[PDB]
């Protein structure tokens, strides 16, 4: 298991534009296209992202290319953020993946707002961090995924993603 396999499980793979859990146009492996309700706007974003006039459909290779860029972007968002970088640096590689996962789903600014959870993670108070992370819109709106991510912070193992 690794961050790519983890997010591929949490995000799925769909080759045509679809709406994500928040109702936003998305494609591939959780590649958010736009928060606009305009499908035409989402299609324009897709063409710009892929570099060709699509029909709203991409190939698996193209989905994986966006996915690699998006994982990279999540890590760079962490490393450039003054609140997220110290927490990331303090974590083992398994829990680093859990933090990347959160930033992939919610963005750098959103995760950086989890001030008290971040402090508990940096303190390595894993059960307390788990309780605090669940008191969130994130947990309430995507509880199964949030439970997998929180369990990964709790244990530092991949048990929530095996079988």
Ligand X SMILES: *SC1=NC(C)(C)N(O)C1(C)C
State which of residues 122, 151, 156, 158 lies at the interface with ligand X (CB under 6 A).
Answer: 151
Query: Cβ of residue 86: shortest distance to K ion, in angstroms?
Result: 29
Q: Does residue 160 belong to the site contacting ligand X (CB under 6 A)?
A: yes
Residue of minimal CB distance from ligand X? 151
CA-angle at 80, arms to 78 and 86, nearest 5°: 60
C-beta of 73 vs 151, nearer to ligand X? 151
Is residue 20 annotated as part of the catalytic site, yes or no? yes
Q: Does residue 11 belong to the site contacting K ion (CB under 5 A)?
A: yes
Count of chain residues binding ligand X (CB under 6 A): 5
Q: Does residue 39 belong to the site contacting ligand X (CB under 6 A)?
A: no
Residue 66 marked ligand-binding: no
In angstroms, the CA 119 to CA 10 distance is 25
Q: Does residue 28 belong to the site contacting K ion (CB under 5 A)?
A: no
Query: Cβ of residue 134: shortest distance to Cl ion, in angstroms?
Result: 8
Q: Does residue 5 belong to the site contacting ligand X (CB under 6 A)?
A: no
Question: Binding site residues for substrate, as ranges?
Answer: 32, 104, 117, 132
Question: Binding site residues, as ranges?
Answer: 32, 104, 117, 132
């Amino acid at each position: 298991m690794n961050i790519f396999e983890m997010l591929r499980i949490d995000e799925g793979l769909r080759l045509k534009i679809y709406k994500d859990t928040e109702g936003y146009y998305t494609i591939g492996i959780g590649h958010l296209l736009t928060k606009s309700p305009s499908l035409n706007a989402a299609k324009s974003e897709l063409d710009k992202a892929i570099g060709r006039n699509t029909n709203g459909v991409i190939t698996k290779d193209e989905a994986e290319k966006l996915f690699n860029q998006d994982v990279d972007a999540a890590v760079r968002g962490i490393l450039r953020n003054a609140k997220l970088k110290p927490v990331y640096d303090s974590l083992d590689a398994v829990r680093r993946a859990a933090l990347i996962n959160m930033v992939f789903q919610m963005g750098e600014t959103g995760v950086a707002g989890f001030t008290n959870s971040l402090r508990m993670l940096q303190q390595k108070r894993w059960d307390e961090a788990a309780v605090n992370l669940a008191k969130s819109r994130w947990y309430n709106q995507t509880p199964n995924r949030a439970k997998r991510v929180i369990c990964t912070f709790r244990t530092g193992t991949w048990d929530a993603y095996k079988n």
